[PDB]
């Protein structure tokens, strides 16, 4: 029983809900494709677009093996402008502790309560951020652990869904404004969510 995989499963399920909600509250896609649902006993917005949904799944299916090995330092949803310059970065800083502690109080109910606080802070974030310019798109970037083995080929999990090294153009954000969202420390996960935004 590999609890690092248990943690990776919780993260990918959460990261899907989070990416969906980010695309909603940042209006990256039209509001019509989104449906109001409840996850972690908290209101969320899931897109019903089949190919957008498959794109997020393929991305996270690829990230998951790296999460299972604790080889991921950041998962970043980056929002591009019409000219492909980054406007905002939604940085999910992730690290499992050196030894995971699995309590039988309730592993699940309390990590989900902690993740629920992340969902609520995302919802209200469009009262602090400036409205993005029209025609924005998004991208997911994965920062791998300092010493990680051949991650470029471990992340190629989905057929015909390749990965690449990002450019400096994909990440360039000189002197941004920092918007902390939520920080959790559990006996299975330390996660930081904050937003960098173009000055």
């Amino acid at each position: 029983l590999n609890f690092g995989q248990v943690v990776a499963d919780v993260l990918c399920e959460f990261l899907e809900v989070a990416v969906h909600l980010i695309l909603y509250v940042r209006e990256v896609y039209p509001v019509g494709i989104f449906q109001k649902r409840k996850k972690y006993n908290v209101p969320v917005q899931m897109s019903c677009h089949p190919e957008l949904n498959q794109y997020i799944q393929d991305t996270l299916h690829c990230v998951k093996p790296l999460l299972e090995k604790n080889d991921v330092e950041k998962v970043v949803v980056v929002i591009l402008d019409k000219e492909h310059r980054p406007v905002e970065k939604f940085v999910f800083e992730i690290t499992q502790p050196p030894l995971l502690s699995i309590s039988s109080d309730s592993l699940l109910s309390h990590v989900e309560q902690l993740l629920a606080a992340f969902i609520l802070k995302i919802s209200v974030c469009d009262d602090v951020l400036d409205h993005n310019p029209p025609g924005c798109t998004f991208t997911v970037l994965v920062h791998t652990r300092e010493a990680a083995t051949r991650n470029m080929e471990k992340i190629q999990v989905i057929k015909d869904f390749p990965w690449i090294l990002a450019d400096e153009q994909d990440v360039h954000m000189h002197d941004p404004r920092l918007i902390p969202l939520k920080t959790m420390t559990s006996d299975i996960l330390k996660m930081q969510l904050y937003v960098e935004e173009r000055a």
């Binding site: 494709i33 677009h49 991208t139």
Partner: peptide, 25 residues
């Protein structure tokens, strides 16, 4: 310097969005 998908997310036309709103709730 991080990793990214080489494939870009789909572009969803307003027509597709209306269809998604209309037929996939």
């Amino acid at each position: 310097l991080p990793l990214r998908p080489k494939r870009s997310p789909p572009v969803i036309s307003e027509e597709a969005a209306e269809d998604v709103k209309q037929y996939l709730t």
